[PDB]
Amino acid sequence: LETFPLDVLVNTAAEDLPRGVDPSRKENHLSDEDFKAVFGMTRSAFANLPLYKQQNLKKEKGLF
């Protein structure tokens, strides 16, 4: 599991995203500290939200 800075996952052009990052699950590539800061819940709780809600939260945060 490769981890990258929040700014890299939010602002890197799609064509330049590190090859190992799943574009549909950018949040999995945040450090634990950044996931906590960005989502405010555990990774498990976030994954337990309906996918549409995970997506909607991510859209506002630039991680969709």
Side-chain angles (χ1 to χ4, degrees), residues 6-30:
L6 175 63
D7 198 51
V8 166
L9 296 174
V10 173
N11 294 300
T12 296
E15 62 271 18
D16 303 330
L17 200 66
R19 79 178 287 280
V21 176
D22 181 341
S24 292
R25 304 286 171 172
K26 288 179 175 191
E27 73 279 7
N28 286 348
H29 301 273
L30 289 170

Side-chain angles (χ1 to χ4, degrees), residues 3-64:
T3 303
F4 297 89
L6 175 63
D7 198 51
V8 166
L9 296 174
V10 173
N11 294 300
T12 296
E15 62 271 18
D16 303 330
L17 200 66
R19 79 178 287 280
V21 176
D22 181 341
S24 292
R25 304 286 171 172
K26 288 179 175 191
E27 73 279 7
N28 286 348
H29 301 273
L30 289 170
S31 63
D32 286 352
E33 291 166 1
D34 278 349
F35 190 96
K36 183 165 177 295
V38 172
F39 296 104
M41 61 184 74
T42 63
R43 290 176 190 275
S44 170
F46 183 77
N48 284 355
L49 289 172
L51 182 62
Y52 84 79
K53 193 68 191 183
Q54 288 179 50
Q55 297 177 329
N56 291 350
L57 285 166
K58 284 165 56 171
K59 291 175 194 299
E60 306 302 284
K61 299 164 181 295
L63 291 167
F64 182 69

